[PDB]
Design a protein around this ligand. Structure first.
Ligand SMILES: OC[C@H]1O[C@H](OC[C@H]2O[C@@H](O)[C@@H](O)[C@@H](O)[C@@H]2O)[C@H](O)[C@@H](O)[C@H]1O
Ligand SMILES: [Ca+2]
Length: 140
């Protein structure tokens, strides 16, 4: 069991109806708060571990927005070493409805060290997700 990774929060700017449910609500430790993106499609969020830092990801945990769990199905998690994700690989694809109000934990088996990781939400989701966590270890 590896430590929770920290980094700078990156992703889609803004929030639905400018209420303020920005990407940062997915990293605040509260499963009742959530990211509600300004648009239906294209929303994403993640971390930049910082220049020169690469982690190997061994687990991802996430919790859907309460009452909108189906807006995660089809979302994917990617690791990359370019901030535009053009070199990304998909670490996990959500294909089952995530349980409400808890962190679903998924193992990742990819030995690559990444500087960047994200959740890329499916169309019609407004990026909805309540909490997102990555675990792993410094690439050796
Ligand atoms: O469409 C993104 C939006 O979906 C839900 O709100 C949908 C609509 O709900 C209606 O009943 C009205 O209240 C209207 O304001 C909305 O267009 C989510 O509740 C909302 O957070 C957002 O994710
Ligand atoms: Ca939250």
């Amino acid at each position: 069991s590896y430590p929770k990774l920290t980094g700078t929060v990156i992703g889609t700017q803004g929030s639905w109806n400018n209420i303020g449910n920005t990407i940062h609500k997915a990293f605040d430790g509260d499963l009742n708060t959530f990211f509600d993106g300004p648009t239906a499609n294209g929303c994403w969020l993640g971390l930049d571990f910082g220049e020169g830092v690469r982690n190997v990801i061994t687990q991802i945990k996430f919790c859907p927005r309460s009452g909108y769990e189906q807006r995660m199905i089809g979302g994917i998690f990617q690791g990359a070493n370019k901030e535009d994700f053009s070199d990304a690989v998909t670490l996990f694809t959500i294909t089952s409805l995530p349980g409400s109000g808890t962190l679903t934990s998924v193992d990742v088996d990819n030995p690559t060290g990444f500087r960047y990781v994200r959740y890329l939400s499916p169309d019609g989701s407004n990026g909805n997700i309540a909490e997102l966590q990555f675990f792993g270890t410094p690439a050796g």
